[PDB]
Design a protein around this ligand. Sequence first.
Ligand SMILES: *[C@@H]1O[C@H](CO)[C@@H](O[C@@H]2O[C@H](CO[C@H]3O[C@H](CO)[C@@H](O)[C@H](O)[C@@H]3O)[C@@H](O)[C@H](O)[C@H]2NC(C)=O)[C@H](O)[C@H]1NC(C)=O
Ligand SMILES: *[C@@H]1O[C@H](CO)[C@@H](O[C@@H]2O[C@H](CO[C@H]3O[C@H](CO)[C@@H](O)[C@H](O)[C@@H]3O)[C@@H](O)[C@H](O)[C@H]2NC(C)=O)[C@H](O)[C@H]1NC(C)=O
Ligand SMILES: *[C@@H]1O[C@H](CO)[C@@H](O[C@@H]2O[C@H](CO[C@H]3O[C@H](CO)[C@@H](O)[C@H](O)[C@@H]3O)[C@@H](O)[C@H](O)[C@H]2NC(C)=O)[C@H](O)[C@H]1NC(C)=O
Ligand SMILES: *[C@@H]1O[C@H](CO)[C@@H](O[C@@H]2O[C@H](CO[C@H]3O[C@H](CO)[C@@H](O)[C@H](O)[C@@H]3O)[C@@H](O)[C@H](O)[C@H]2NC(C)=O)[C@H](O)[C@H]1NC(C)=O
Ligand SMILES: *[C@@H]1O[C@H](CO)[C@@H](O[C@@H]2O[C@H](CO[C@H]3O[C@H](CO)[C@@H](O)[C@H](O)[C@@H]3O)[C@@H](O)[C@H](O)[C@H]2NC(C)=O)[C@H](O)[C@H]1NC(C)=O
Ligand SMILES: *[C@@H]1O[C@H](CO)[C@@H](O[C@@H]2O[C@H](CO[C@H]3O[C@H](CO)[C@@H](O)[C@H](O)[C@@H]3O)[C@@H](O)[C@H](O)[C@H]2NC(C)=O)[C@H](O)[C@H]1NC(C)=O
Ligand SMILES: *[C@@H]1O[C@H](CO)[C@@H](O[C@@H]2O[C@H](CO[C@H]3O[C@H](CO)[C@@H](O)[C@H](O)[C@@H]3O)[C@@H](O)[C@H](O)[C@H]2NC(C)=O)[C@H](O)[C@H]1NC(C)=O
Ligand SMILES: *[C@@H]1O[C@H](CO)[C@@H](O[C@@H]2O[C@H](CO[C@H]3O[C@H](CO)[C@@H](O)[C@H](O)[C@@H]3O)[C@@H](O)[C@H](O)[C@H]2NC(C)=O)[C@H](O)[C@H]1NC(C)=O
Ligand SMILES: *[C@@H]1O[C@H](CO)[C@@H](O[C@@H]2O[C@H](CO[C@H]3O[C@H](CO)[C@@H](O)[C@H](O)[C@@H]3O)[C@@H](O)[C@H](O)[C@H]2NC(C)=O)[C@H](O)[C@H]1NC(C)=O
Ligand SMILES: *[C@@H]1O[C@H](CO)[C@@H](O[C@@H]2O[C@H](CO[C@H]3O[C@H](CO)[C@@H](O)[C@H](O)[C@@H]3O)[C@@H](O)[C@H](O)[C@H]2NC(C)=O)[C@H](O)[C@H]1NC(C)=O
Ligand SMILES: *[C@@H]1O[C@H](CO)[C@@H](O[C@@H]2O[C@H](CO[C@H]3O[C@H](CO)[C@@H](O)[C@H](O)[C@@H]3O)[C@@H](O)[C@H](O)[C@H]2NC(C)=O)[C@H](O)[C@H]1NC(C)=O
Ligand SMILES: *[C@@H]1O[C@H](CO)[C@@H](O[C@@H]2O[C@H](CO[C@H]3O[C@H](CO)[C@@H](O)[C@H](O)[C@@H]3O)[C@@H](O)[C@H](O)[C@H]2NC(C)=O)[C@H](O)[C@H]1NC(C)=O
Ligand SMILES: *[C@@H]1O[C@H](CO)[C@@H](O[C@@H]2O[C@H](CO[C@H]3O[C@H](CO)[C@@H](O)[C@H](O)[C@@H]3O)[C@@H](O)[C@H](O)[C@H]2NC(C)=O)[C@H](O)[C@H]1NC(C)=O
Ligand SMILES: *[C@@H]1O[C@H](CO)[C@@H](O[C@@H]2O[C@H](CO[C@H]3O[C@H](CO)[C@@H](O)[C@H](O)[C@@H]3O)[C@@H](O)[C@H](O)[C@H]2NC(C)=O)[C@H](O)[C@H]1NC(C)=O
Ligand SMILES: *[C@@H]1O[C@H](CO)[C@@H](O[C@@H]2O[C@H](CO[C@H]3O[C@H](CO)[C@@H](O)[C@H](O)[C@@H]3O)[C@@H](O)[C@H](O)[C@H]2NC(C)=O)[C@H](O)[C@H]1NC(C)=O
Ligand SMILES: *[C@@H]1O[C@H](CO)[C@@H](O[C@@H]2O[C@H](CO[C@H]3O[C@H](CO)[C@@H](O)[C@H](O)[C@@H]3O)[C@@H](O)[C@H](O)[C@H]2NC(C)=O)[C@H](O)[C@H]1NC(C)=O
Lengths: 70, 141, 141, 141, 141, 70, 141
Amino acid sequence: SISVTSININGQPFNINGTAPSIPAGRTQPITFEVTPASGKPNFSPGASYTATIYFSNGQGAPATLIYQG
Amino acid sequence: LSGAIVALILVIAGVIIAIAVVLFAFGLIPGISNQGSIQVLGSGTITNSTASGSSRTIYNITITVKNTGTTSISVTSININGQPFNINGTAPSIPAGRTQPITFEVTPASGKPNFSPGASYTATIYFSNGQGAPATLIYQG
Amino acid sequence: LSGAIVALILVIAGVIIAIAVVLFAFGLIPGISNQGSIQVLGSGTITNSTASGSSRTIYNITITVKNTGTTSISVTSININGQPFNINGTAPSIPAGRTQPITFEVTPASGKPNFSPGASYTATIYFSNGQGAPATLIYQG
Amino acid sequence: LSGAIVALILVIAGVIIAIAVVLFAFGLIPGISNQGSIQVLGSGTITNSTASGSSRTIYNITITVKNTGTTSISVTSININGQPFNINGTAPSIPAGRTQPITFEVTPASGKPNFSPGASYTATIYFSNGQGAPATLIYQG
Amino acid sequence: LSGAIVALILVIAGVIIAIAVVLFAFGLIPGISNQGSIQVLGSGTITNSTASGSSRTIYNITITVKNTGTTSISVTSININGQPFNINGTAPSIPAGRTQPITFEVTPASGKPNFSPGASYTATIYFSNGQGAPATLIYQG
Amino acid sequence: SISVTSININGQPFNINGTAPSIPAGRTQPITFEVTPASGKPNFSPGASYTATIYFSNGQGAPATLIYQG
Amino acid sequence: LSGAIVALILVIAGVIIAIAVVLFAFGLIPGISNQGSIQVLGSGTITNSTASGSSRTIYNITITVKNTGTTSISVTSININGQPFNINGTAPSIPAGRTQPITFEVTPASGKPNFSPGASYTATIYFSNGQGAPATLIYQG
Ligand SMILES: *[C@@H]1O[C@H](CO)[C@@H](O[C@@H]2O[C@H](CO[C@H]3O[C@H](CO)[C@@H](O)[C@H](O)[C@@H]3O)[C@@H](O)[C@H](O)[C@H]2NC(C)=O)[C@H](O)[C@H]1NC(C)=O
Ligand SMILES: *[C@@H]1O[C@H](CO)[C@@H](O[C@@H]2O[C@H](CO[C@H]3O[C@H](CO)[C@@H](O)[C@H](O)[C@@H]3O)[C@@H](O)[C@H](O)[C@H]2NC(C)=O)[C@H](O)[C@H]1NC(C)=O
Ligand SMILES: *[C@@H]1O[C@H](CO)[C@@H](O[C@@H]2O[C@H](CO[C@H]3O[C@H](CO)[C@@H](O)[C@H](O)[C@@H]3O)[C@@H](O)[C@H](O)[C@H]2NC(C)=O)[C@H](O)[C@H]1NC(C)=O
Ligand SMILES: *[C@@H]1O[C@H](CO)[C@@H](O[C@@H]2O[C@H](CO[C@H]3O[C@H](CO)[C@@H](O)[C@H](O)[C@@H]3O)[C@@H](O)[C@H](O)[C@H]2NC(C)=O)[C@H](O)[C@H]1NC(C)=O
Ligand SMILES: *[C@@H]1O[C@H](CO)[C@@H](O[C@@H]2O[C@H](CO[C@H]3O[C@H](CO)[C@@H](O)[C@H](O)[C@@H]3O)[C@@H](O)[C@H](O)[C@H]2NC(C)=O)[C@H](O)[C@H]1NC(C)=O
Ligand SMILES: *[C@@H]1O[C@H](CO)[C@@H](O[C@@H]2O[C@H](CO[C@H]3O[C@H](CO)[C@@H](O)[C@H](O)[C@@H]3O)[C@@H](O)[C@H](O)[C@H]2NC(C)=O)[C@H](O)[C@H]1NC(C)=O
Ligand SMILES: *[C@@H]1O[C@H](CO)[C@@H](O[C@@H]2O[C@H](CO[C@H]3O[C@H](CO)[C@@H](O)[C@H](O)[C@@H]3O)[C@@H](O)[C@H](O)[C@H]2NC(C)=O)[C@H](O)[C@H]1NC(C)=O
Ligand SMILES: *[C@@H]1O[C@H](CO)[C@@H](O[C@@H]2O[C@H](CO[C@H]3O[C@H](CO)[C@@H](O)[C@H](O)[C@@H]3O)[C@@H](O)[C@H](O)[C@H]2NC(C)=O)[C@H](O)[C@H]1NC(C)=O
Ligand SMILES: *[C@@H]1O[C@H](CO)[C@@H](O[C@@H]2O[C@H](CO[C@H]3O[C@H](CO)[C@@H](O)[C@H](O)[C@@H]3O)[C@@H](O)[C@H](O)[C@H]2NC(C)=O)[C@H](O)[C@H]1NC(C)=O
Ligand SMILES: *[C@@H]1O[C@H](CO)[C@@H](O[C@@H]2O[C@H](CO[C@H]3O[C@H](CO)[C@@H](O)[C@H](O)[C@@H]3O)[C@@H](O)[C@H](O)[C@H]2NC(C)=O)[C@H](O)[C@H]1NC(C)=O
Ligand SMILES: *[C@@H]1O[C@H](CO)[C@@H](O[C@@H]2O[C@H](CO[C@H]3O[C@H](CO)[C@@H](O)[C@H](O)[C@@H]3O)[C@@H](O)[C@H](O)[C@H]2NC(C)=O)[C@H](O)[C@H]1NC(C)=O
Ligand SMILES: *[C@@H]1O[C@H](CO)[C@@H](O[C@@H]2O[C@H](CO[C@H]3O[C@H](CO)[C@@H](O)[C@H](O)[C@@H]3O)[C@@H](O)[C@H](O)[C@H]2NC(C)=O)[C@H](O)[C@H]1NC(C)=O
Ligand SMILES: *[C@@H]1O[C@H](CO)[C@@H](O[C@@H]2O[C@H](CO[C@H]3O[C@H](CO)[C@@H](O)[C@H](O)[C@@H]3O)[C@@H](O)[C@H](O)[C@H]2NC(C)=O)[C@H](O)[C@H]1NC(C)=O
Ligand SMILES: *[C@@H]1O[C@H](CO)[C@@H](O[C@@H]2O[C@H](CO[C@H]3O[C@H](CO)[C@@H](O)[C@H](O)[C@@H]3O)[C@@H](O)[C@H](O)[C@H]2NC(C)=O)[C@H](O)[C@H]1NC(C)=O
Ligand SMILES: *[C@@H]1O[C@H](CO)[C@@H](O[C@@H]2O[C@H](CO[C@H]3O[C@H](CO)[C@@H](O)[C@H](O)[C@@H]3O)[C@@H](O)[C@H](O)[C@H]2NC(C)=O)[C@H](O)[C@H]1NC(C)=O
Ligand SMILES: *[C@@H]1O[C@H](CO)[C@@H](O[C@@H]2O[C@H](CO[C@H]3O[C@H](CO)[C@@H](O)[C@H](O)[C@@H]3O)[C@@H](O)[C@H](O)[C@H]2NC(C)=O)[C@H](O)[C@H]1NC(C)=O
């Protein structure tokens, strides 16, 4: 089982609010988690797509695309 | 001994980063769709809207916009006749799935325009989804 | 004497561990390099499945799909017109080497869509491979 | 004895440096995003801005720029028609998340341009995030 | 001594595995790069095949088709006037290098068409290649 | 002289039916051998490309593309 | 004792070889540009050049060619309107940096073509770069 530890979105660092989700071994899931900007504030536009990097307890990170819904 | 142990770490890391980059390339694809959400319907109008003797020329751009996307989208800039214009006050937005006459105030950023009553100007309107749309605007006076 | 016998042990052990890591690198190749994919053929269709004033809107999605791999693979998500959708019920599994029209039901994950009868929407279907395919779906009504 | 003790140190150091390099490769990834922050909207304008009889030709470049990034970004250079230009005074900056008509003074670094009234010049604008953007500029006189 | 012999093994094994991947890349070329296609020549025709008040409407489709590839290829779907149709019975297979009038029967997949005698409909035929061809069909009655 | 010891097609294990084919020293040649799926039931499609990794008596594995004909 | 000295030499040599490989990667770039040294510009002409009812029809291929490379470059082969053709004489060659008319005699490689006065035919001329340039020849004879 491995958990998220940080996310960076559109270049900006974010902190996970509350307990970070843990993903069980061998499993596919939609995870959901809350985040706050670490410093500054973002300028997300409805329907725009942002490159993000999620970092896991492995130290491994994954590039991702997130679409801002509103 | 060291070299083989190092090569093993870098092989496994190579597989992990390569797969993550391939998944990212598949993961981009949904974002591309939204670049086409807006289209501009018919001729719009430009109208001189400033008060008498005011320091700033301010015009009024009315256009029908259609939003085929799943999110609200806003006008971010307009280029008229080759001139960039600044958008005054709050940008207008068009709701998801709707078609509406949209109205906004603009002021010229380069020089001053010399619009002629009943003359037809090609604009390009730019929207918050990162899209440009060609438009025709008729100056009303 | 000692230094030379130890140097020889570490030469021999170096050969052994280096060859073990080289054989491991050859052993990765089958897992990382499976060719072939789910291919999506022609346009699909979206149809309103929602009935009897139900609280959740459900859509049929029908599309022709060709599995060119050697294993059965299933749909896992679809994104349509930028919006994410969940598969309702059990997702369809496409047998190895086979071409089929698949049909599956979907609900919007959040918000709601604004499909127009006869309009064409870009969609991305994601399979159990993590591979996705861009597709065009025409909304039927 | 010595050889085995040395090999042990170099094995453990090998693991540590290899892991640190793998973590660095994952740690680079957020920096790549920022290379796409800017885009240039519509035609800009060039205007001759120098005073009568002055030794230096100085032009005025007005363009709409959109910053989708999370930080302020500034214009660092412009190349017009294939000529490099120097940027005079302070570089302009566009705030995080905003779309603005941006204006700056430039002077030619190679030879002199011979801009023609109403003629259209392809430029490339370069920004402090390390990004180039193609632009069209119309010379106003 | 050990470190250098291990470095040399990993140089040699690196050459071997790199050349193996380069030879694999050359080995992909024939499968990914088959030239030539089904070409659709002139207009086709749609004719009402439905008889005796049958519950399902069936249409003849006749069109001239030229296979410029080296393998026999079959139709798999047609879309006409935006609407999907299923091939009834066994789909026709077009021999390599050959020009033929093919004829096949089709039924609407969902809904029903509104063909007008003498009107021309844009259609897309999809072949076993996954390749499709736009076509014009004239409805005969 | 070096022989095919095992083959994996598109990630799946496969068994050489007959005796193993063997290629003499210094030779370049066509090599042909009969093979069966080791587990399950694959289904190849005409003109589609499948990777095979062929493993030789060196322990060496070579990736190859096979195009299905049948 | 030796293991550390060997590790140091291979660390230092690793830096040298990695930098050398990076420099080699750039050093290819001016080289590969020569792949596009030739431009064929304007319309060319093709003219009957044979005499006295001789057994070979021979033609006049005149084109204007610009060589941007640092070596003299020659016509290796020509294909006219899809058909193979053989240069009768020795190949024409265009010096480095020159723009000039180039003229050469050519014969059909197979069959018997028949050009019509004032009609336009494509030729692709293949140069000693392996580069092919399409050109239009107008027939004169
Ligand atoms: C970040 O994580 C906190 C837990 O790590 C979480 O605390 C919990 O808060 C909920 C209720 O929170 C509501 O009210 C607060 C004001 O008190 C708002 O800031 C917040 O946004 C919510 O509207 C409470 O039921 C629960 O017991 C708390 N848990 C713990 C362990 O303290 C924060 O709420 C969360 N921050 C946000 C903004 O959601
Ligand atoms: C997400 O929701 C937040 C709460 O509604 C909102 O923050 C509030 O924003 C207003 C002013 O910010 C303006 O700019 C943002 C740009 O994203 C607009 O979305 C928003 O409509 C306003 O025009 C501020 O006065 C108020 O104090 C904020 N409240 C909080 C909770 O901080 C965010 O703006 C909104 N979007 C983003 C990208 O975070
Ligand atoms: C920019 O032009 C807009 C288009 O006319 C306008 O907003 C619109 O308002 C009109 C109605 O305007 C009349 O009626 C109001 C009373 O309801 C009076 O205040 C005013 O004097 C008018 O003659 C409406 O029909 C239209 O739909 C609105 N906009 C849209 C969505 O098209 C603005 O007033 C104008 N602004 C300036 C400063 O010129
Ligand atoms: C928008 O309306 C303004 C008045 O509501 C008007 O200002 C007046 O301008 C006139 C003269 O207009 C000419 O000269 C100006 C420069 O002075 C040009 O920009 C303009 O295109 C005309 O060629 C002036 O006599 C008067 O004092 C101004 N004020 C009032 C109360 O009348 C703007 O000129 C007008 N702009 C456009 C484009 O029509
Ligand atoms: C480079 O061009 C700029 C674009 O015009 C300009 O800055 C802009 O200033 C204009 C307003 O200029 C007029 O009004 C001021 C009085 O407010 C007078 O000083 C001047 O004589 C003008 O006719 C403004 O509309 C525009 O938004 C500004 N820039 C932007 C962000 O677009 C500079 O003045 C000019 N510099 C030179 C040396 O040419
Ligand atoms: C989406 O695909 C479903 C199968 O995956 C399909 O279910 C089948 O429904 C048919 C009957 O469907 C008719 O009636 C419904 C209303 O009940 C209409 O919405 C529909 O358009 C048809 O007119 C039934 O015979 C069959 O046994 C069902 N099979 C399964 C596996 O459920 C849905 O009908 C289909 N939805 C639409 C709108 O086509
Ligand atoms: C698919 O069918 C759904 C069931 O009939 C329908 O949802 C119902 O819609 C009405 C009002 O939504 C309106 O807007 C949609 C736009 O798509 C129109 O198609 C529809 O005619 C109405 O004008 C709502 O009152 C009712 O509660 C909904 N019922 C459910 C099951 O949610 C959808 O609207 C329809 N289309 C789409 C795109 O999902
Ligand atoms: C989403 O998938 C569910 C299975 O994963 C499926 O449950 C099955 O439902 C059918 C009958 O469903 C009808 O009635 C319900 C209300 O109870 C409606 O919401 C629904 O739309 C249908 O009209 C039942 O025969 C079957 O046993 C259920 N299977 C299981 C495993 O529970 C849901 O119906 C499906 N949602 C929709 C909207 O189709
Ligand atoms: C920008 O404006 C300057 C004046 O504000 C102008 O300087 C004048 O130039 C004219 C003649 O211009 C021609 O010749 C010059 C070389 O002398 C060329 O660079 C230019 O493109 C024209 O072909 C001269 O008679 C006069 O004395 C100068 N000064 C004034 C006060 O008029 C610049 O030439 C002008 N640059 C451009 C590109 O328009
Ligand atoms: C190599 O090209 C350089 C680029 O032009 C040039 O240095 C530049 O000098 C120009 C200005 O040159 C003009 O003005 C000076 C008077 O100030 C005259 O001496 C001369 O005749 C010119 O027409 C300057 O704009 C530019 O910024 C300088 N260089 C840079 C940093 O771009 C050199 O003169 C030239 N050298 C040779 C031998 O060709
Ligand atoms: C669509 O193509 C069919 C062949 O793929 C063809 O079947 C042949 O039919 C002919 C006789 O057709 C005549 O009679 C039917 C009514 O029975 C009319 O609909 C039709 O227009 C003709 O007047 C028969 O001799 C032949 O053996 C059949 N061959 C096969 C392979 O079935 C259909 O007739 C054709 N439909 C139409 C409307 O032309
Ligand atoms: C769609 O394809 C079927 C074969 O895939 C074909 O079945 C054949 O049918 C013919 C005779 O069909 C006639 O009668 C049926 C009613 O039984 C009508 O629906 C049909 O339109 C024809 O008038 C038969 O000789 C042959 O043996 C069948 N072949 C097989 C393999 O079953 C269907 O007829 C065909 N549908 C239509 C509408 O033509
Ligand atoms: C799978 O491998 C077997 C050995 O590697 C091979 O055995 C050889 O068989 C041939 C003759 O086989 C025929 O008869 C058998 C029944 O006994 C059939 O199953 C088969 O299809 C053939 O028709 C024999 O001459 C030879 O000596 C055998 N070799 C050895 C080493 O014993 C099988 O033939 C092979 N399977 C197939 C289907 O070829
Ligand atoms: C697939 O491989 C089978 C053996 O690996 C082979 O069966 C053996 O067939 C040969 C017949 O000799 C011919 O083999 C093929 C065509 O059959 C040609 O490439 C070749 O030049 C010869 O003409 C037979 O002698 C032998 O006993 C069979 N079995 C063994 C154990 O050797 C199949 O023929 C082959 N099929 C295809 C389509 O390639
Ligand atoms: C086709 O190419 C030949 C070499 O590229 C070229 O040979 C040259 O010939 C000229 C003189 O040729 C005359 O005489 C011959 C008979 O021997 C006739 O066929 C021809 O039409 C001319 O009348 C000679 O000076 C030169 O040295 C030769 N070059 C070489 C490299 O040997 C042929 O002339 C050419 N065909 C034609 C029709 O010109
Ligand atoms: C077609 O090209 C032939 C050679 O490629 C050429 O024959 C050679 O002719 C020249 C004569 O010199 C003249 O060439 C043409 C007109 O004849 C003019 O463009 C050019 O300016 C010269 O006036 C002769 O010296 C030479 O020996 C011939 N052969 C070779 C191998 O060079 C034809 O003249 C030419 N025909 C046409 C109509 O362009």
